[PDB]
Symmetry: none
Subunit: 365 residues, 2 copies
């Protein structure tokens, strides 16, 4: 029995999404920048996609840009926006629980002479709003925060973070790494009042190689990739049409079925929680404020990587620090931590299997 | 929101109490048995502690002995008192709802040749007085009873129990496990007419690792721990001065604010009972005669441990033979979880608990 419990890492493409993609690989394979019939045709579907996305996120088609992945989007927004504020501003604010896409870019901007401050998080993984108000000064031009954490699943108070920031400084811009929202928790930008958002299609049953970017009309931005002039001159290179069509279709479906999907995952998760604790596990994920599919747990007397290998031997897939560290998690617990991340297609039959097999692995040890 | 509802197991130390302890760890760390200045200084403070407790409990300092915990106090008293009645008396009476500290010590003495009798309890968990009058006989040298049960909260008729035992035999000694009293229900030994009483500081915001023992001036007793002669030669070993100073200060506070604390906890508890019944909860705790902070509830088709696990995942802590002695059905017993407040819990927390336990019930 193949049990895939690592959906925060990546997911399988939805059969419906793949079917549509195939059309643009075999038949409508034209270059959206061409003026002939097939060019005109591909461009239509690329734009319908951009529209499907804008609609789901509650924004204007012109505010959606397509990249190669969330990482590229994050590099692009952080690097070029910092680039527009050179010799004018220099303070950037973020948190220690961000994905390395963000953290590593910040490290880069520091090398370049930028001041990168880090707002701490509480024991549950939630950013500390009080410290945020303080840390934000007049020299602060950009605040980069994530909507939910990929390792533990902790949801951040994006609304509050935004409000608190606007008050302390009305000119500061806000970027939201929303990669883990789509298909797991509602996320709309319509009234969120943020300026930049990043997404990765393969995290919600879309294909790999496609990133989705939200850039509020008017805010600063520049090309990370100069060239032919695609994406309104802001991101060149031939667009990935089969990829874009699929990504849009995947977002639409993912959100459309969110409600029923979350309830289902929320249920399976509860079964895992009680079962794992009865076997001796420690629950790191704060159930009351996290993605309903994410469950980070630890068996103190076993290396997470060892539990990971054993489980993999039975056809079960899960994953296995700077986040737990930022949370103050004890080194012993961190060392044995693993992450179980469920999708809409996981089942109770699978949960029963995981519980049954991990109990064996634990007994043999 | 971290919601701690397991204060019958243990509690967080009062900031006031900890402030006082630290002084004896880094500054006044002398050994109370020393003749030099620092020895004297420590001894002075340890004796004030003993005096603060005697005052609070309404007895004489000389009748207060410090131990490592309630369990040690209980072992010490039952075993040594029993020891002094070897080849003389052989009957010990107690109840089936006692804490294992007592029950296991009893199981121990039985194996050692003593005759242990168990008075039954009614459905609410209250000891059966009539049955007690008959059990007590001429060969009964000691009766061990708790002032309030820790799992269901049922309060015991200590006054009556002592009265009834005195009438049936003016010589029988009475020991009371008063661990669950302090800070929750008033409890004074002044006129209670008992011979022994056990306590555990960490149940009322005192530090763990400290037991308080009451022994009536005159009654039998012997060392459980032989040695240097500390605690009037009855409990040797270096005294946990920081622990003692803190325990006495915790006891003084808990009782000084008993009135307000109990009213507050009683309120929070009623709101809980109200909301939990509105969710189908069976209430096991007898509301009319229990601790104002204790609430044992059970759900029809949900194992307590399971319910406990989920609640814990949300930052809510509750715990999961007492129910058996009460005649509570296996079905119900298996779903029972124990909610045990403290002076510091809040209504904001009660709302969270109720709000979150409902969500949890939907997934089950
Ligand atoms: C919160 C978060 N941000 C960014 C990424 C990076 O995604 P990618 O590798 O698709 O660019 C991931 C994964 C993630 O979980
Ligand atoms: C009634 C009662 N007696 C004794 C104890 C034992 O306390 P300790 O572990 O502190 O000695 C407890 C707990 C208890 O609830």
């Amino acid at each position: 029995m193949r049990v895939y419990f690592d959906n925060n890492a990546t997911t399988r493409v939805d059969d419906r999404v793949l079917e549509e993609m195939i059309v643009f690989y075999r038949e409508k394979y034209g270059n959206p920048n061409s003026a002939h019939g097939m060019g005109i045709e591909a461009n239509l579907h690329m734009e319908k996609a951009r529209e499907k996305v804008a609609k789901v996120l509650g924004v204007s088609p012109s505010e959606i840009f397509f990249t190669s992945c969330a990482t590229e989007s994050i590099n692009w927004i952080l690097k070029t926006v910092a680039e527009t504020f050179e010799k004018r501003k220099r303070t950037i604010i973020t948190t220690p629980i961000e994905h390395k896409a963000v953290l590593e870019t910040m490290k880069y901007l520091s090398m370049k002479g930028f001041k990168v401050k880090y707002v701490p998080v509480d024991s549950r993984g939630v950013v500390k709003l009080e410290e945020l108000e303080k840390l934000v000064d007049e020299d602060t031009f950009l605040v980069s925060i994530m909507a939910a954490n990929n390792e533990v699943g902790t949801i951040q108070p994006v609304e509050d973070v935004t409000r608190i920031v606007k008050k302390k400084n009305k000119e500061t811009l806000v970027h939201v790494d929303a990669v883990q929202t789509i298909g797991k928790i509602p996320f709309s930008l319509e009234k969120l009042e943020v300026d930049y958002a990043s997404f990765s299609a393969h995290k919600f049953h879309g294909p790999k190689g496609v990133g989705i970017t939200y850039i509020r009309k008017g805010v600063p931005i520049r090309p990370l990739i100069h060239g032919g002039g695609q994406e309104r001159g802001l991101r060149s290179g031939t667009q990935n049409v089969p990829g874009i069509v699929g990504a849009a279709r995947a977002m639409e479906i993912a959100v459309e079925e969110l409600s029923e999907a979350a309830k289902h995952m929320e249920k399976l998760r509860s079964k895992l929680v009680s079962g794992l604790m009865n076997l001796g596990a420690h629950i790191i994920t704060p159930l009351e404020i996290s993605l309903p599919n994410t469950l980070s747990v630890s068996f103190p007397n076993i290396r997470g990587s060892t539990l990971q290998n054993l489980l993999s031997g039975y056809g079960i897939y899960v994953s296995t620090r700077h986040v737990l560290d930022a949370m103050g998690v004890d080194r012993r617990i961190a060392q044995g931590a693993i992450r179980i991340s469920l999708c809409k297609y996981n089942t109770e039959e699978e949960v029963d299997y995981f519980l049954k097999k991990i109990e064996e692995i634990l007994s043999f040890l």
